[PDB]
Amino acid sequence: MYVKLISSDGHEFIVKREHALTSGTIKAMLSGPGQFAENETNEVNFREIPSHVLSKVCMYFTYKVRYTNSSTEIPEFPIAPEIALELLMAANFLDC
Amino acid sequence: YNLIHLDPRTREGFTLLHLAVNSNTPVDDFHTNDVCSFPNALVTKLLLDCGAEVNAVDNEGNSALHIIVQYNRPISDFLTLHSIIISLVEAGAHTDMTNKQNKTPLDKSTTGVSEILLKTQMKMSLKCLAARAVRANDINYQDQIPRTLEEFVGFH
Amino acid sequence: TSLKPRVVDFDETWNKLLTTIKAVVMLEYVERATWNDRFSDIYALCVAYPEPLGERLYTETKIFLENHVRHLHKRVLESEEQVLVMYHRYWEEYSKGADYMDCLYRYLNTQFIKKNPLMEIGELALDMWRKLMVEPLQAILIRMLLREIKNDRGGEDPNQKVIHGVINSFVHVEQYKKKFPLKFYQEIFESPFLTETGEYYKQEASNLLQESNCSQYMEKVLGRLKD
Amino acid sequence: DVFLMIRRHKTTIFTDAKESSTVFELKRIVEGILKRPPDEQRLYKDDQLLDDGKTLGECGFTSQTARPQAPATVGLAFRAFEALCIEPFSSPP
Amino acid sequence: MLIKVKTLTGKEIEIDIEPTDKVERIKERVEEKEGIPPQQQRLIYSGKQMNDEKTAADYKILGGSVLHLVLALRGG
């Protein structure tokens, strides 16, 4: 399925569920009350985390799904020094 | 468990785990060195089932994972280097945690076998990448980030 | 806004977190936006400047869960004849309640509980269900669990779901104990039911020794074993 | 083989695809997650238009640029043709 | 050429691969006797792990030797 991620100021995101469950507090926000009878969006409202950092953590979701337990060189994730501090807080809130 | 919770630390900052994973820990020659061999994966395992703080830091900032990868005998006793590493990183031994001299345990490998074992046991996390990018550019984080996150930044 | 630590006072945010977690442990209805904002609330209170008040939130969750499970205990004690129908009705709505509370408190279990001795909320809510809802209400549960299964033994067909829920409410409570995870069930329902079964089958075998000869005894014991 | 983000206006759909795969697969994928007929959206690359015949890996969306740790921003605009309206992210600190 | 690669309990693995045989499938034959599937026996060639084709001449073309293999799972 595909899951949906609000940002702080609009900036909607849509990531595959098997890609966004690699984080820790998405697997919890998606295991909460409600059977999720629709099973198409089940949007999560990240009220506090900004848009660029959410884009970078979605890119990390794709990156970690692609490169998990691989025998290649695991090419480096490019972190902007400006986004580095906020992305650290997000990856603290978004477990793993 | 009682002894570990009494936090036994030598003058080098070594805990029970640090010496149990160190080949440099002296073993008594009088009827003992023929039986007790360091590093030993069993004792480390028995020291992790009892709940030793695996991310402990010594005077040099080395954890148990830093010390174990300093082992210079990966062929004579490979299992005692393998069966300990999987024993070390199973309770939360931060593979990317960095010592006081800014050395990742991958950097302190001195052995292809040990570094490939660490790489196989290493699991990536955006927390680690973000912390490493923060410290590699020296952004002021004190009184701006979570209190528990300052220690994590200090890890990398 | 943002994930920066901020000086937040515990009172009204903890009350507004209660407003949702009370409905969570009763399997009630909460909005998805509300439940996805309580995660941000729990994070903000878990790293709040200048003192990380995760300890105060942990103790207040202890107090709330203790009070709620004690209220469930006092309510189940009223229905003395049908406590099994009332215990299992208040356990299917508390097992999932405990799991959802664990999901809501995910950041607490990986920042303050397991990193500092302390019990994670998915284990604490269940440990408040044996300490305050099973251990004090033990004999009443066990003797009539044996009575219901004995009625099933003789001729009756009681509520299979209620009994099979209460019985696994002894292995499910101790799911978070890595050492002997069945030990509670091995001393609350295993040994008493084993001894009661031994007595009942001893007297049953004595009754069937004289009723029928050795030929029909084989078929009868085989049928009773298959049943 | 490629990893791309389908950035229409507000939403930004992250998806994986192949060099041999074509634009039609992209539009089929974005149909079931945005509920839009394929003729009501025209894809892009920076500002260059594309059609429904050419492959995804043809119009500059290679594995050396649509890598997942920095995916290639493919722009979309939806019909009520409207202009390619994309608003940027928030300001980094 | 038969191999004498050590294992997790001091066992042996019969690769039966000549020095010109690539280690892409040579480890599979060694792990065939032990039991491990091909793309799971992350063997260490006395200092490094074979990748891609990895002709055995890279690992000194040794005869038999003792190659301690890693039990790395989920590599399939």
The nearest CA of chain A is from the CA of D47 a distance in Å of 21
Per domain, the residue ranges of chain D are: 1-93
**In angstroms, rounded to a whole number, what is the distance separating the alpha carbons of residues D8 and D67?**
19
Chain C hits for A32, CB-CB cut-off 8 Å, are: 30, 32, 35-36, 100, 103-104
Q: What is the per-residue burial (b if ≥16 Cβ within 10 Å, else e) of C211-224? A: eeeeeeeeeeeeee
Closest alpha carbon to C80 in C25, C32, C143, C17: C143
How many angstroms separate the CA atoms of A4 and C217, rounded? Answer: 66
Which other chains touch chain E, taking contact as 3+ CB pairs less than 8 Å apart?
Answer: A, B
Nearest partner of B74 among C30, E49, C197, judged by Cα: E49
Strand pairing class (A2-6; A44-45): parallel
- Using CA atoms, how far residue B82 sits from B75, D29, E70, in Å, is 11, 45, 8
The two three-digit tokens of residue A51, written as one number:
């848009």
Interchain CB distance below 8 Å, A24 and C33 = no
For the range C172-175, what are the long-range contacts, defined as Cβ-Cβ under 8 Å and sequence gap of 24 or more? Answer: C172/C95, C172/C126, C173/C126, C173/C127, C173/C129, C173/C130, C173/C134, C174/C126, C174/C130, C175/C126
Q: Which helix (H) or strand (E) holds D4?
A: strand D2-8
Give the torsion through C-alpha atoms of C101, C106, C111, C117, to 10 deg: 40
Q: Is the dihedral of CA B25, B30, B33, B35 positive or negative?
A: negative
| Token couple for E20 | 């010109």
Verify A-D touch: 3 or more CB pairs within 8 A: yes
User: What phi, psi does D74 have (nearest 5°)?
Assistant: -95, 125
Query: What's the rounded Cα separation, in Å, for the pair E35 and E30?
Result: 9
- Distance between CA E20 and CA E57 in Å, rounded? 6
- Tell me, yes or no, if B76 comes closer than 8 A to chain E by beta carbon: no
CATH number of D1-93: 3.10.20.90
Q: Tell me how many domains chain E contains.
A: 1
Q: Are strands D72-75 and D2-8 parallel, antiparallel or unpaired?
A: parallel
Please classify residue D20 by burial: count the beta carbons closer than 10 Å to its beta carbon, then call 0-12 exposed, 13-18 middle and 19+ buried.
exposed
Domains parsed from chain A with CATH numbers: 17-93 (3.30.710.10)
Q: Does the beta carbon of B129 lie under 8 angstroms from any beta carbon of chain A?
A: yes
Residue C122: other Cβ atoms inside 10 A: 20
> In sequence order, what DSSP letters do the residues of chain A get, joined into one string?
-EEEEE-SSS--EEEEHHHHTTSSHHHHHTSSSS--SS-S---EE--SS-HHHHHHHHHHHHHHHHHTT-SS--PPP---TTTHHHHHHHHHHTT-
CA distance C52 to B148: 9
CB of E69 within 8 A of CB of E44? yes
Q: Please name the member of A2, A8, A78 whose beta carbon is closest to the beta carbon of D69.
A: A78
Q: Judge whether B144 is closer than 8 Å to chain C, CB to CB.
A: yes
C148 close to C158: Cβ distance less than 8 angstroms: yes
Asked whether the beta carbons of residue C52 and residue B149 sit closer than 8 angstroms, the reply is no
Q: What is the DSSP letter of E59?
A: G
Helix (H) or strand (E) holding C147: helix C139-154
Which residues in chain E have their CB less than 8 angstroms from residue B111's CB? 47
The residue in chain D having the minimum alpha-carbon distance to the alpha carbon of residue A74 is D69
Using a CB-CB distance cutoff of 8 angstroms, which residues of chain E are in contact with residue A69? 74-75
Which residues pair with residue D17 across a beta bridge? D2
Q: What is the CA radius of gyration of chain D?
A: 13
Physical contact, E and D (3 or more Cβ pairs within 8 A): no
Q: How many CB pairs under 8 A join B and E?
A: 28
Amino acid at B55: N
Resolution of the determined structure in angstroms stands at 3.5
- Domain holding E65: CATH number? 3.10.20.90
Using DSSP, how many helices (H) and how many strands (E) does chain D show? 1, 7
Q: Identify the three-state secondary structure at position C167.
A: helix
Assign B146 to helix, strand or coil.
coil
Interface size, chain A vs chain C, as Cβ–Cβ contacts under 8 Å: 66
What six digits make up the tokens of D76?
């979309």
Torsion sign, CA atoms D53, D59, D61, D64: positive
Q: How many residues does chain A have?
A: 96
Query: Chain E contacts of A71, Cβ < 8 Å?
Result: 42, 49, 51, 75
Rounded to the nearest 10 degrees, the angle between the axes of helix B79-88 and helix B41-49 is 10
Q: Which of D10, D12, D93 sits opposite A82 (nearest CB)?
A: D93
Domain residues for the domain of E31 are: 1-74
Query: 3-state class of E45 per DSSP?
Result: coil
CB-based contact, B154 to chain A, within 8 Å:
no
Cis amide leading into C50 (omega within 30): yes
Count the neighbouring beta carbons within 10 Å of the beta carbon of residue E64: 13
Could you give the CA distance from residue B61 to residue B18 in angstroms, rounded to a whole number?
Answer: 11
Rounded Cα gap, residues D4 and D66, in angstroms: 6
Q: Is B75 close to E70, i.e. CB distance below 8 A? A: no
According to DSSP, the β-strands at D41-42 and D77-78 are: antiparallel
Neighbours of E7 (CB within 10 A): 21
Method: cryo-EM
Q: Which residues of B126-140 are buried (b: 16+ CB within 10 A; e: fewer)?
A: bbbbbbbbbbeeebe
Amino acid at site D65:
T
Per-residue DSSP letter, D15: E
For residue D90, what is the DSSP state?
Answer: P
As given in the structure block, the two tokens for residue B153 are 């930044």
Type of residue numbered A64: K
**Nearby residues of A26 by Cβ (< 8 Å), 6 or more positions away:** A3, A20, A44, A94
Neighbours of chain B (3+ CB pairs under 8 A): A, C, E
- Quickly count: other Cβ atoms within 10 Å of residue B49's Cβ: 13
Contact check, Cβ <8 Å, C39/A95: no
Residue with tokens 């050395």: B103
Closest CA to B56 of B11, B17, B109: B17
Contact C52 B146 (CB under 8 A): yes
Q: Which amino acid is at E56?
A: A
Only one residue has tokens 């702080």, namely A8
Judging contacts by C-beta atoms under 8 Å, the chain A residues touching residue B133 are 79, 81, 84, 87-88
